[PDB]
Amino acid sequence: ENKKKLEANPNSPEYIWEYAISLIDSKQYWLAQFQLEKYIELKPNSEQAFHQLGIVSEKLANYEQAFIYFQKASQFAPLNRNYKYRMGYNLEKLGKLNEAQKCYSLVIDMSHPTDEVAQFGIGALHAKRGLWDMALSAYLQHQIQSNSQNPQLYYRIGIAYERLYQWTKSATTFEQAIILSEIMNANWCFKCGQAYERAENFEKSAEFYQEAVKRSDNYNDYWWYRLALMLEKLGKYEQSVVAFQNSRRRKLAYAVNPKDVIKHKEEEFLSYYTEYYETLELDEKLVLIESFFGGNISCNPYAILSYMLENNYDYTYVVVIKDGTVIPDNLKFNRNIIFIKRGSDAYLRYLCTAKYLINNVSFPYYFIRKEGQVYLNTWHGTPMKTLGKDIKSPFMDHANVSRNFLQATHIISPNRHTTDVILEQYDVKDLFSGKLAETGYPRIDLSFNLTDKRRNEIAEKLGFSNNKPVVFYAPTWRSKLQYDLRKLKSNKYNLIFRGHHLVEQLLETINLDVTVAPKDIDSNELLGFCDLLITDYSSIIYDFLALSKPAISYIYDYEEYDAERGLYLKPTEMSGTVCTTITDVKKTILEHISSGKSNVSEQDIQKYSYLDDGQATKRTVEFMLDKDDSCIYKYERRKSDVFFEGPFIPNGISRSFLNLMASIKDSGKNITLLINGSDIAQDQKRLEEFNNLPSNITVLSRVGRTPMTLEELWVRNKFEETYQIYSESFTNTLLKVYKREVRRLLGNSSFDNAIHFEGYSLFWVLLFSQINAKKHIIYQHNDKYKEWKGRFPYLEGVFNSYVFFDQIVSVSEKTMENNILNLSKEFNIPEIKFTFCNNPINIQQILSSAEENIEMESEFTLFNGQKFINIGRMSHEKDQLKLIEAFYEAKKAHVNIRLFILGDGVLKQDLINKIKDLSLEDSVYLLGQKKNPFPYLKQADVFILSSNHEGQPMVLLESLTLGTPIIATDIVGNRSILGENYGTLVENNKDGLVQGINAYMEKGGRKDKFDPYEYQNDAMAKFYSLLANLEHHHHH
Ligand SMILES: [Zn+2]
C-alpha cells in the first residue's frame, strides 16, 4: 500500500523493519525475505525477527528454513507455545512425521487443561489458521485416540467438514453433536440445516431449520427465510407461507417509520409483543412452563411437566429459564422440550402462541392472556406471613399478582386456608372469572412417589454409602448458622442443608458434617429422601405433614421475624416439635431417630395437608384440561362496580368520592377502584387521603407501560397533541389500545357500572369507555369549558370523548346547564346525555366530629354573645379583607359581637396588619389551622363565607346540618349548592355582608327548614337512578 522504501537512508534497523513488515502485510514475502536477512545481519538477537523469518519461509514453502527460524525463536523464549506448534507444523509439511509429533506433544503438555488444544487436540490450532484439511485429520485422530464423545469436538469436526465443502459429512456430524448435546443449541441446529441444504437433503434441512427457529432466543429473519425456502422445495406451501410471513419481525403495514415514532426502548420492546399478541395463532399442542421467573425449574410447574412427560402426553413443552439456570436430569436429551430465556423474542412469541400456560408466581406486566388460551397459576405455598394488600412496604407491590389472577383461567389450592387468603389478600375474589380447584399441590407428588431408582441416585450424588438417617435443614431467607451447624455435627445422621445461593456460597464447608444439596435436586424430592425435616417459617412444612415423618420448627428468632413480617401462627400452634434452642434441636433429633415416633398433630394434617395423597398432579392436569370438576371451589361472585377517582390529591373531588364511598359501602356489591399507584406513592398527603377509603374497597393499580403497536404509538401521540376527531378508522385504531389495556388490567371481568368520577385524566376517560359494563358514567365537577380554556388543554380530548359514555353527570344543576350551554352544541353531545347529581355528605361523621373530639378550645369562643365563624385559606379568593371591613361597619349598629377565622395562608400578615387599623384587636381573633373545625362550627351562631371564587363549598351544607345558619356572597359556587331555598345569600361587597349581619341580628337565622337527611336521601336517590337495570353488557 505504501512503499516506505522512500527512506532509502540505509543501515537503519528501524527503517529496515518498517519496510519489511509493510512488505509482509502486502503479501510480498519473497521481497521481505532479503530485508529480514539484512535485519538479522544487524540485530542477530531479535526474537521477532526470527518469528517473521519463519512465517516468511513457511509462506514461501521453504519448510526446512521455517523450522530453523522458528527453532531459533523458540530458544529465545521456551515458554512460548505458538513457536513450538510452528516447529511441528513445518516438520509435518517436510515429511519428518516423528520429529513433528514430539513437537505437537510438547505443545499439548505445556497447555492449560481447558485451553482448546487440551480437550480437542492439536487440530484446534490448525483451525485457528484456516488449515482445514490438516485440522480435520487431527480432529479425527484425537477423537479416535481419546474415544471422545464431547459434542463440542463433533461440532468442530462438522465445521472443518463444512469449510472443506464436504456438506454431507458436515451435516451428519453436526447432527451427532446435536444429538449428543444435553440441550439442543439453536445455533447448532442452523449450522446442521445449512449443511443439509448445501448437501441437498431438503427433508433433513427443513427438519433442522425448523428446530433452529423454534429454539432461537433472538429473532433471526435469515433463519425463517431459509426454512421457508426448504419448505417450498418439499412442497409444503402452506407452512412455506407461514415461515415466509415470519421472515420479517414486523408483518403489519404500519405506514409509519419506527425511527420517528419510538421514543423509548420499552416502547420498541412492547411493540413487538403487541403484534405477536394480535397476529399469531395458538398452537393447541404447546405448553409453556415457568417457575420463579425462570430462575429455576422446580415447584408445581416442574411436577406437572414431569408428570405429562412420563405419561407421554401429546405436547411440545417450552420451559422458561434464565442465564445459568440449572436443568433437571429428566429434561435433558429430550427433543420435545424447548428452553427459551425470559424476556427474549421467543419469550414474547411463545406467550402469544402457547395454548397452555403454567406459572407459579406471575408473568410480567405486559402479558395478556389471548382468547382461547388456558392459563393455570398454581401459586407456591400455604401463606404464613403478611401477604398481598396488607404489605404496604412498596406501595401496590402485589398489583401484578392480582393482575395475573385476573388473567388466569385456572387456579389450584393446597387447602381452604390458602384459598381464603389468596382470594381476599389479593383483592380478586369477586372479580376472578376463572376456576379455583382445591387439588393439593402437584409438587408434593414428587415427595410421595420417590422411586428406589431416584433415591439411590440422590444418595450417590450426595456421598451417602450407608442408610444412616437423613436430616434436612431448609430455613428461609432473613453468624448463627455457623454456630448451629457445628452444634449439629454428629455421626448418628447425615445432615443436608438448602438455603439461599448467597448463604451456601460463603458457608466454609470444612469443620462441618453438613452437605449442601446440589441445585439439580428438587426440594420435594429431598423431602421424600430425608427422614426428619427442620424448618422455621417456610411453607415447605405443609408439604411434609402427610409423609409420616418427624418435623422440627426451630424458631430461635420468632420475636424478630414476627416483628418484621407478621406471622399468622403463634409458636405453640406450629407443626412438629417446636424448639427455640439449637441444643434442643439435637436432643429432639436423637429422641425421634431412636423412638421412631411421629410428632405431627393430626389436627394440623386436617387443616393444611388433607389433600396430599400423592395423586394431586393427575387432579391438576385433568382440572386444567377441563376434564374433572370434582375439586372446584364453587362460590357466588358479587356483582361489581368500578370507579376512578384520580391520584387522590386532597381536594373537593376526593372529599366527594370518600363521602360517596361511605354511602354505598354496605350495598352488597363489589366496589372496585382503579388507580395509578406510582402517582400516589410519591406524595405523603396523597397516601393519607387514599388510606381513608372504606376497607371493603377492592383496589387495582396499573403496572408498567401500555403495550402498543407502531401505528398505535403514532395515533396516540397525534391525538394527545391535537385532541381532534379525524375519522372512523383513526378512532378505531386509538380505541383498540384501550380495549387491550382494559383486558390487561381486568381480564374477562364485567361490571354493572363503570364510573369515571374525576372527569379529568384523558387516559382513564378512554380506558373506562372500553370496560365491559352495563353503563358508562363520567362526572363533571366544574365548568369544564372554563377549565379547558384556563388551565388544561387536554380537556378538548375529553369533550371529544364524551361520545363514548352514556351519562355525563354534573355535581349540581346550575353546573349542568352551564356545561350544556358550553359543550352540547360545540361538541355534538346530545342534551339527553347530560344530568346532575348533588354531592353526598357524611352525616354521621359531621355529627360525630362536632359532638365528639372534646378538644382544646380557645377561651375566647367559650364566652360571648353572638359568634361568627369563617374557615378559609387566605388565598384572596376567600377575600377575608372584605369580611373584616364588613365587620368594622357591622360593629357600629350591634356591638356585642365576636368573629373568628380558621386556617392559614399567604395573605396572613396583611390580616393582622388590618387588625390594628380598625382598632379591633379585642373583637376579632385569628385562630390557627384546626384539624377538626366541627366543634367550632356547631357552637358558632353564624357561618360567614365572603369568598369571591368557590369551587366545592361543602362547608356551607356542613354548617347547615349542624344547625348554625349561613350568610354567603352570591357567587356561582355558593349559589350552585344553596340556590333560593337554602341559606341566605348576599351581594359580593362590603354593604351586602353588613346587610346580612344586620338582617340576622333583627330577624335571626333564615327559616329555610333544612333537613340534612332530606338532602342525603335526594342525593343518593338521584345517584342510584343513574345506575343500570338488568341491561346488556357492552363497550363503546
Ligand atoms: Zn356504555
Numbering used by the authors: 100 to 577, 588 to 1145
What does the paper say about this structure?
Capsules are long-chain carbohydrate polymers that envelop the surfaces of many bacteria, protecting them from host immune responses.
Because attempts to crystallize Cps7D failed, we solved the crystal structure of the homologous capsule polymerase Cps3D from App3 (38% sequence identity; A0A2S0ETM3; 1138 residues). 1 and 8) crystallized in the P 3 2 1 space group with one molecule in the asymmetric unit, and the electron density maps allowed us to trace residues 100 to 1,145. The Cps3D protomers build into a physiological and functional dimer (overall size ca. 170 Å × 95 Å × 70 Å). The dimeric architecture is assembled primarily by an extensive interaction network between (1) the two TPR (α2–α15) and TPR′ domains and (2) the TPR domain and the N-terminal domain of CgaT′ (CgaT′-NT). CgoT adopts the typical GT-B fold of glycosyltransferases consisting of two Rossmann-fold domains. Similarly, CgaT displays a GT-B fold. The CgoT and CgaT active sites are located buried between the corresponding two Rossmann-fold domains, including the essential residues for catalytic activities.
